Design a protein around this motif. Sequence first.
Motif, PDB file in Angstrom:
ATOM      1  N   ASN G 137       0.837  -1.188   0.000  1.00  0.00           N
ATOM      2  CA  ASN G 137       0.000   0.000   0.000  1.00  0.00           C
ATOM      3  C   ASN G 137       0.880   1.248   0.000  1.00  0.00           C
ATOM      4  O   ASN G 137       2.111   1.176  -0.009  1.00  0.00           O
ATOM      5  CB  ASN G 137      -0.946  -0.021   1.197  1.00  0.00           C
ATOM      6  CG  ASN G 137      -1.910  -1.189   1.153  1.00  0.00           C
ATOM      7  OD1 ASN G 137      -2.004  -1.974   2.098  1.00  0.00           O
ATOM      8  ND2 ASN G 137      -2.635  -1.307   0.051  1.00  0.00           N
ATOM      9  N   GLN G 138       0.243   2.419  -0.011  1.00  0.00           N
ATOM     10  CA  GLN G 138       1.025   3.649   0.000  1.00  0.00           C
ATOM     11  C   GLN G 138       1.706   3.848   1.347  1.00  0.00           C
ATOM     12  O   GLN G 138       2.920   4.100   1.413  1.00  0.00           O
ATOM     13  CB  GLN G 138       0.140   4.846  -0.338  1.00  0.00           C
ATOM     14  CG  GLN G 138       0.939   6.039  -0.797  1.00  0.00           C
ATOM     15  CD  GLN G 138       0.178   6.936  -1.741  1.00  0.00           C
ATOM     16  OE1 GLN G 138      -1.043   6.842  -1.870  1.00  0.00           O
ATOM     17  NE2 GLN G 138       0.903   7.810  -2.425  1.00  0.00           N
ATOM     18  N   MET G 139       0.949   3.716   2.440  1.00  0.00           N
ATOM     19  CA  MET G 139       1.585   3.926   3.728  1.00  0.00           C
ATOM     20  C   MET G 139       2.545   2.789   4.010  1.00  0.00           C
ATOM     21  O   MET G 139       3.548   2.989   4.688  1.00  0.00           O
ATOM     22  CB  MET G 139       0.577   4.028   4.874  1.00  0.00           C
ATOM     23  CG  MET G 139      -0.162   2.733   5.150  1.00  0.00           C
ATOM     24  SD  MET G 139      -1.244   2.700   6.580  1.00  0.00           S
ATOM     25  CE  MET G 139      -0.006   2.504   7.850  1.00  0.00           C
ATOM     26  N   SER G 140       2.258   1.594   3.484  1.00  0.00           N
ATOM     27  CA  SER G 140       3.157   0.464   3.686  1.00  0.00           C
ATOM     28  C   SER G 140       4.531   0.767   3.116  1.00  0.00           C
ATOM     29  O   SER G 140       5.544   0.670   3.818  1.00  0.00           O
ATOM     30  CB  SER G 140       2.570  -0.796   3.045  1.00  0.00           C
ATOM     31  OG  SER G 140       3.586  -1.680   2.598  1.00  0.00           O
ATOM     32  N   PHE G 141       4.578   1.185   1.850  1.00  0.00           N
ATOM     33  CA  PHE G 141       5.849   1.498   1.210  1.00  0.00           C
ATOM     34  C   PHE G 141       6.543   2.666   1.903  1.00  0.00           C
ATOM     35  O   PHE G 141       7.736   2.590   2.227  1.00  0.00           O
ATOM     36  CB  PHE G 141       5.618   1.800  -0.272  1.00  0.00           C
ATOM     37  CG  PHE G 141       6.777   2.481  -0.948  1.00  0.00           C
ATOM     38  CD1 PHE G 141       7.900   1.765  -1.325  1.00  0.00           C
ATOM     39  CD2 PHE G 141       6.733   3.837  -1.221  1.00  0.00           C
ATOM     40  CE1 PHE G 141       8.964   2.391  -1.954  1.00  0.00           C
ATOM     41  CE2 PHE G 141       7.792   4.469  -1.848  1.00  0.00           C
ATOM     42  CZ  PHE G 141       8.909   3.743  -2.214  1.00  0.00           C
ATOM     43  N   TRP G 142       5.809   3.755   2.155  1.00  0.00           N
ATOM     44  CA  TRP G 142       6.466   4.942   2.698  1.00  0.00           C
ATOM     45  C   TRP G 142       6.912   4.733   4.141  1.00  0.00           C
ATOM     46  O   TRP G 142       8.005   5.164   4.526  1.00  0.00           O
ATOM     47  CB  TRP G 142       5.550   6.157   2.573  1.00  0.00           C
ATOM     48  CG  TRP G 142       5.547   6.703   1.185  1.00  0.00           C
ATOM     49  CD1 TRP G 142       4.574   6.550   0.245  1.00  0.00           C
ATOM     50  CD2 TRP G 142       6.587   7.469   0.567  1.00  0.00           C
ATOM     51  NE1 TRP G 142       4.937   7.184  -0.919  1.00  0.00           N
ATOM     52  CE2 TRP G 142       6.169   7.756  -0.747  1.00  0.00           C
ATOM     53  CE3 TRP G 142       7.828   7.946   1.000  1.00  0.00           C
ATOM     54  CZ2 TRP G 142       6.946   8.498  -1.632  1.00  0.00           C
ATOM     55  CZ3 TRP G 142       8.599   8.682   0.120  1.00  0.00           C
ATOM     56  CH2 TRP G 142       8.156   8.951  -1.180  1.00  0.00           C
ATOM     57  N   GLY G 143       6.088   4.072   4.956  1.00  0.00           N
ATOM     58  CA  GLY G 143       6.480   3.768   6.317  1.00  0.00           C
ATOM     59  C   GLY G 143       7.614   2.768   6.391  1.00  0.00           C
ATOM     60  O   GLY G 143       8.460   2.856   7.279  1.00  0.00           O
ATOM     61  N   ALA G 144       7.646   1.796   5.475  1.00  0.00           N
ATOM     62  CA  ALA G 144       8.802   0.911   5.410  1.00  0.00           C
ATOM     63  C   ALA G 144      10.064   1.701   5.103  1.00  0.00           C
ATOM     64  O   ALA G 144      11.101   1.507   5.749  1.00  0.00           O
ATOM     65  CB  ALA G 144       8.577  -0.176   4.360  1.00  0.00           C
ATOM     66  N   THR G 145       9.982   2.624   4.141  1.00  0.00           N
ATOM     67  CA  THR G 145      11.133   3.460   3.815  1.00  0.00           C
ATOM     68  C   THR G 145      11.574   4.284   5.020  1.00  0.00           C
ATOM     69  O   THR G 145      12.774   4.404   5.296  1.00  0.00           O
ATOM     70  CB  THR G 145      10.794   4.374   2.635  1.00  0.00           C
ATOM     71  OG1 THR G 145      10.674   3.592   1.441  1.00  0.00           O
ATOM     72  CG2 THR G 145      11.875   5.423   2.435  1.00  0.00           C
ATOM     73  N   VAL G 146      10.615   4.850   5.753  1.00  0.00           N
ATOM     74  CA  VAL G 146      10.945   5.699   6.896  1.00  0.00           C
ATOM     75  C   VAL G 146      11.553   4.873   8.026  1.00  0.00           C
ATOM     76  O   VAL G 146      12.587   5.241   8.599  1.00  0.00           O
ATOM     77  CB  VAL G 146       9.695   6.465   7.366  1.00  0.00           C
ATOM     78  CG1 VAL G 146       9.891   6.999   8.776  1.00  0.00           C
ATOM     79  CG2 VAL G 146       9.371   7.594   6.399  1.00  0.00           C
ATOM     80  N   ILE G 147      10.923   3.746   8.363  1.00  0.00           N
ATOM     81  CA  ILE G 147      11.334   2.965   9.526  1.00  0.00           C
ATOM     82  C   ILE G 147      12.663   2.263   9.275  1.00  0.00           C
ATOM     83  O   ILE G 147      13.531   2.226  10.155  1.00  0.00           O
ATOM     84  CB  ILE G 147      10.228   1.965   9.913  1.00  0.00           C
ATOM     85  CG1 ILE G 147       8.965   2.705  10.357  1.00  0.00           C
ATOM     86  CG2 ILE G 147      10.706   1.032  11.014  1.00  0.00           C
ATOM     87  CD1 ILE G 147       9.103   3.416  11.684  1.00  0.00           C
ATOM     88  N   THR G 148      12.849   1.689   8.081  1.00  0.00           N
ATOM     89  CA  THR G 148      14.062   0.919   7.820  1.00  0.00           C
ATOM     90  C   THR G 148      15.311   1.786   7.900  1.00  0.00           C
ATOM     91  O   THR G 148      16.403   1.276   8.175  1.00  0.00           O
ATOM     92  CB  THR G 148      13.970   0.248   6.450  1.00  0.00           C
ATOM     93  OG1 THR G 148      12.616  -0.154   6.204  1.00  0.00           O
ATOM     94  CG2 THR G 148      14.867  -0.977   6.401  1.00  0.00           C
ATOM     95  N   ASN G 149      15.175   3.093   7.670  1.00  0.00           N
ATOM     96  CA  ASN G 149      16.319   3.993   7.733  1.00  0.00           C
ATOM     97  C   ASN G 149      16.830   4.208   9.152  1.00  0.00           C
ATOM     98  O   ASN G 149      17.908   4.791   9.317  1.00  0.00           O
ATOM     99  CB  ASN G 149      15.959   5.339   7.104  1.00  0.00           C
ATOM    100  CG  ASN G 149      17.109   5.943   6.325  1.00  0.00           C
ATOM    101  OD1 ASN G 149      18.049   6.489   6.903  1.00  0.00           O
ATOM    102  ND2 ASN G 149      17.043   5.846   5.002  1.00  0.00           N
ATOM    103  N   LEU G 150      16.093   3.762  10.173  1.00  0.00           N
ATOM    104  CA  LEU G 150      16.535   3.941  11.551  1.00  0.00           C
ATOM    105  C   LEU G 150      17.815   3.174  11.857  1.00  0.00           C
ATOM    106  O   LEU G 150      18.505   3.505  12.827  1.00  0.00           O
ATOM    107  CB  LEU G 150      15.433   3.514  12.521  1.00  0.00           C
ATOM    108  CG  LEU G 150      14.158   4.360  12.529  1.00  0.00           C
ATOM    109  CD1 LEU G 150      13.241   3.941  13.668  1.00  0.00           C
ATOM    110  CD2 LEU G 150      14.493   5.841  12.622  1.00  0.00           C
ATOM    111  N   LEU G 151      18.149   2.158  11.058  1.00  0.00           N
ATOM    112  CA  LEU G 151      19.369   1.391  11.278  1.00  0.00           C
ATOM    113  C   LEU G 151      20.632   2.187  10.978  1.00  0.00           C
ATOM    114  O   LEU G 151      21.726   1.721  11.309  1.00  0.00           O
ATOM    115  CB  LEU G 151      19.349   0.118  10.431  1.00  0.00           C
ATOM    116  CG  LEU G 151      18.747  -1.126  11.089  1.00  0.00           C
ATOM    117  CD1 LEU G 151      17.231  -1.113  10.983  1.00  0.00           C
ATOM    118  CD2 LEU G 151      19.321  -2.389  10.470  1.00  0.00           C
ATOM    119  N   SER G 152      20.512   3.363  10.360  1.00  0.00           N
ATOM    120  CA  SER G 152      21.681   4.181  10.062  1.00  0.00           C
ATOM    121  C   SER G 152      22.299   4.809  11.303  1.00  0.00           C
ATOM    122  O   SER G 152      23.394   5.374  11.208  1.00  0.00           O
ATOM    123  CB  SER G 152      21.313   5.274   9.058  1.00  0.00           C
ATOM    124  OG  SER G 152      20.144   5.965   9.466  1.00  0.00           O
TER     125      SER G 152
END
Lengths: 60, 245, 11, 122, 66, 87, 387
Positions: G137-152
């Motif tokens: 979904n839209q929020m699925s893709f965008w939230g995945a992009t946002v959350i996965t970047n926390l590993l930086s």
Amino acid sequence: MASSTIYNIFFRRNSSFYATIFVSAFFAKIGFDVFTDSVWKRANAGLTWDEVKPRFLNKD
Amino acid sequence: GTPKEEGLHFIQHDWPQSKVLSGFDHASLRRGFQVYREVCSACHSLNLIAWRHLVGVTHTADEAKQMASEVEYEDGPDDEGNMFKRPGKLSDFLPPPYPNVEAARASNNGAAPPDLSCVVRGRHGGQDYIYSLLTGYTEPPAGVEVPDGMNFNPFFPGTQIAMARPLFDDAVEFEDGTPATTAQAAKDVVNFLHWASEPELDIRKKMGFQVITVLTILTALSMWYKRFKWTPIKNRKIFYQRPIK
Amino acid sequence: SPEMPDFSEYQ
Amino acid sequence: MKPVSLAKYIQKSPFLTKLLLPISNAYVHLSGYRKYGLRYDDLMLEENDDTQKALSRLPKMESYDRVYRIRRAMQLSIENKILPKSEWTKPEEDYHYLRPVLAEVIAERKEREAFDALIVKK
Amino acid sequence: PLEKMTQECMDAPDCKEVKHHFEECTARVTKKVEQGDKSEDCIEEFFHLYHCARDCADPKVFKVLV
Amino acid sequence: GGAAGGKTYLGWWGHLGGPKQKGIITYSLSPFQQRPMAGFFKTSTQNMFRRVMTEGLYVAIPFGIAYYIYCWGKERNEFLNSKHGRH
Amino acid sequence: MKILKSNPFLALANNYMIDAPEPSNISYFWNFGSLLACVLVIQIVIGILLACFYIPNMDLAFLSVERIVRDVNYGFLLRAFHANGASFFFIFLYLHIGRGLYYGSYKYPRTMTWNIGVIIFLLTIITAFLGYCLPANQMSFWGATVITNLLSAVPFIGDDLVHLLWGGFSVSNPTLNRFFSLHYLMPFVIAALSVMHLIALHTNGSSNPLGVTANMDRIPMNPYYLIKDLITIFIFLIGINYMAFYNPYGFMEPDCALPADPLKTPMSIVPEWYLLPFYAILRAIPNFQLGVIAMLLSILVLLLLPLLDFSAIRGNSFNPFGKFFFWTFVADFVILAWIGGSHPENVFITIGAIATIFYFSYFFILIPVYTILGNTLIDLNLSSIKR
Ligand SMILES: COC1=C(OC)C(=O)C(C/C=C(/C)CC/C=C(\C)CC/C=C(\C)CC/C=C(\C)CC/C=C(\C)CC/C=C(\C)CC/C=C(/C)CC/C=C(\C)CC/C=C(\C)CCC=C(C)C)=C(C)C1=O
Ligand SMILES: CCCCCCCCCCCCCCCC(=O)OC[C@H](COP(=O)([O-])OCC[N+](C)(C)C)OC(=O)CCCCCCCCCCCCCCC
Ligand SMILES: CCCCCCCCCCCCCCCC(=O)OC[C@H](COP(=O)([O-])OCC[N+](C)(C)C)OC(=O)CCCCCCCCCCCCCCC
Ligand code: HEC
Ligand code: HEM
Ligand code: HEM
């Protein structure tokens, strides 16, 4: 008769208990299906495709 | 954010399908489908609904076959490569006006007509928002101007829609005979789009009633049986005979 | 030892 | 680790005790363990070795009375009700009867622990 | 049908204060723009007036839309 | 079996690891002789009334304060980003 | 000897279900373990069927879900039931955690049980985050992009773990494939951890509302506690059935019925509602790494509870200060969730900062102070009775 006969027939042995349970379930399913069908049919009057058929296509 | 940049809150109405024991209005569904085909089939695509879906809901099987047999589709390779057109079947999807998104962007300035299959369920308000957007075209108030290619529409976020007034008075001829005003037609289109979003509403709401009734009866029986079995513990009596040495 | 508590209320 | 309390430094100054008596009265009334006919020392946790050993050194009468009180309290808690206001734990009977034994056991354990760690400083 | 009823509700006594505010807008903002100033836009009063009119009008018309 | 298990505080039936009891007589009836739905409404109503009057403010105060600040925050945030709020 | 006490498998079943000594006055708040187990079983069973029609690919994931919804026989039931059960899981998890926290079920002899439960909660959060990203979904893709970047935020190998997890340079086909595989795998590990949870708990029994020992009046599980659970089971069934038959997308944000457009930037990027408070906590800290550390600590602070609770008694049934502060903290949690849901505007950021400050103060300043004060007041009153 009284109330001891009822216990003697179905509620005496587990074998004569599960069969009663299953038969009652089989009948209750049909009863509830009929009830819900009737109530849903009564709920919608002049709102389904079967009762709007003559208005549209019968005139061609 | 600012009220201008977030739009006006939609108005609230009452629809037949919003009750607890009511389905759709299939005559309104058919009229909305007719308005869809005669108005927004030119630019808006609905490439998630097949001709077989309308069979038994808004059209008979013969009517659906006859209507679908007029659209030309493209089929698989011939005996020697090639691609040959078809007269259409009953298992094809409704034709999209544009072949791809880039053509749609090129035709309509720079916008992109969204697909209408799941728009009602994907907007903050659904039917109310769509109806208000359709019927909410007004001249701008003093102080705010609209550049060429944009229209004023308070219900749209930013009050700048890229559409023009799609539904004018007497745009379609209804088979039933109802006058085609901008209010009736918008209502019928909204109903048809809501149906296209969730075609399974009737069966779901028909099953739920029986499920809830049976579950309620079962819960009412359980609440009594627990009290039956837990009785010799809740009503105990404890006496303390002091153990004199 | 005491007497039997009265259970007639729940009987 | 262990329960802590500033229950002696306040006792050092009489003025603080005189000021804090009504607040303590209200708090103990609000706690509501006396509504179940219990005593405070019954609620103390007994899962370590010290309290387990202490509970085996009480007089038999105290152990039997504690057992009856706990059983009656749990029987009442089954049905979500409390005793009438007549059968409430009066202040005179709500004395400390388990703390001295626990103190003796802790003193013994602390003495052994002290002997354990030693050093020779010539 | 909807436009006529919405206009009638706009002139109805139910919504008159927001209409007064919108009138004071129109006068002041028109004077400002014709002076040569593009800095003010009171779309909020239009929002309020339109919401009042639509709430007044929509339930009336929606019943006879069959 | 054996296996020489560790130390617990539960045990099993017969040896539950509790203090020795004495002189505790207990009476109870049969579920088929007693009557369910007997005195349920009265006792339940009294217990609910007592619980409401006793616990009460313990829940009433924090939830009320939270709701008040929620309403005030929503109203103020709506006001500030409007026309007159920014000025 | 009875067969149930002799055969090893029947003995295992009996010792845990048939004849198990339990406290005789546990309330209705002890009924949520069975509810959690049933919800997990329903989730696994339904997901096994849901995996039979899903194609794990970024280019072809949404159309597969739509085919499940509107083409398969009774597929809408499967989808709605899976989503709503996953939602109800977190409600029952929060109720379980609240029950454990309020009655002081973390201060021995049952502390391993608490740690296992915390680990299970972490794994459940990870599994839910992995699962809700699948439908593309839209929020699925965008939230995945946002959350996965926390590993930086990792100092040395940061910005490389992110690329390793993404399997490329952005959320694409390999990311969806890996997420599908991991979401399939994890629930079995969660079930094994729950089995270990039960095994650890069984060796010392459950608590009681009074907080005193219950080794005097014990009753067996069946039939006394095998019927008390049926009422809650049926009530939860009623709730989930209504939510799945009359309002399936009632817990779902309106920005989830659109295909993921990697150019369309949504107005607000938020995860699902059950993970909202942690997202609210994360955005409060102006710094980046400090925000991630605080977000992790917000869940990892439950392990430190046993060693900073100085109370002479167990539970809150006889502790007014705890009764007040627990409900105050619950209200603060609800307010934190509300703030996380909304926009990050002027007043909202201040309110969120205040809520985060209070939330992190509760587990460090409030608890020892009020426990010590209660001990002192009770001891002072008890020391001046006969005088
Ligand atoms: C005090 O604590 C206590 C608790 O709390 C009160 C408790 O909780 C419990 C715990 C009790 C339990 C329920 C134990 C487990 C619970 C847990 C501890 C945690 C949860 C554990 C689980 C994950 C449960 C296990 C479930 C698993 C492993 C997955 C289940 C999967 C399925 C059931 C399959 C799903 C079905 C599908 C998808 C298809 C099925 C196959 C078909 C038949 C389809 C049709 C196919 C065909 C027709 C093909 C042809 C068929 C053939 C060949 C047959 C033809 C006939 C021939 C003869 C040839 C205890 C013990 C306890 O004491
Ligand atoms: C094992 C895992 C943990 C447990 C998971 C849940 C398992 C649920 C299925 C089993 C539920 C019942 C467990 C066994 C209870 C039992 O002992 O059955 C016998 C009872 C009668 O036993 P009685 O109450 O003591 O009365 C005596 C009767 N005499 C002897 C006088 C004739 O007679 C009855 O109890 C008949 C009613 C119940 C029998 C099943 C019919 C209803 C369920 C049908 C199947 C639907 C369930 C599918 C989903 C589970
Ligand atoms: C349900 C639809 C109708 C389906 C209708 C057909 C179902 C099949 C009917 C029979 C099912 C039960 C099989 C065993 C029957 C039996 O007679 O077992 C008796 C004994 C009772 O055990 P005991 O007498 O207390 O101890 C004996 C120990 N000695 C003295 C020998 C040292 O052994 C025991 O029972 C011990 C109790 C625990 C072991 C049995 C647990 C499982 C019982 C049910 C198994 C079948 C379940 C089928 C489910 C599809
Ligand atoms: C002039 C060609 C055209 C016509 C005719 C047309 N549409 Fe549109 N539509 C568009 C375009 C282009 C957009 C994109 C507008 C934008 O993104 O600002 C759009 C937007 C929309 C949207 C999306 C609104 C939103 O907030 O995203 C909906 C819903 C919609 N139209 C419905 C309809 C309906 C119903 C009809 C028939 C009454 C219709 N349209 C007729 C081209 C058209
Ligand atoms: C064997 C176990 C499981 C399997 C095979 C499985 C499989 C799946 C699949 C295939 C989807 C895609 C849904 C779709 O395509 O429409 C999904 C979605 C989802 N799963 Fe699971 N799952 C399992 C267990 C769980 C558990 C244990 C949880 C939570 C604790 C969970 C939470 C979710 C959520 C939140 C979604 C997204 C909801 C939605 O798509 O609307 N799942 N799962
Ligand atoms: C998620 C966080 C969890 C925590 C912190 C936790 C912790 C605890 C604690 C401390 C107890 C004992 C309470 C007492 O004796 O007073 C308990 C009981 C129990 N737990 Fe958990 N647990 C969690 C999740 C789960 C899960 C996921 C399951 C099952 C899938 C589960 C199943 C049980 C059961 C069956 C009991 C005993 C009966 C009951 O308390 O309802 N728990 N848990």
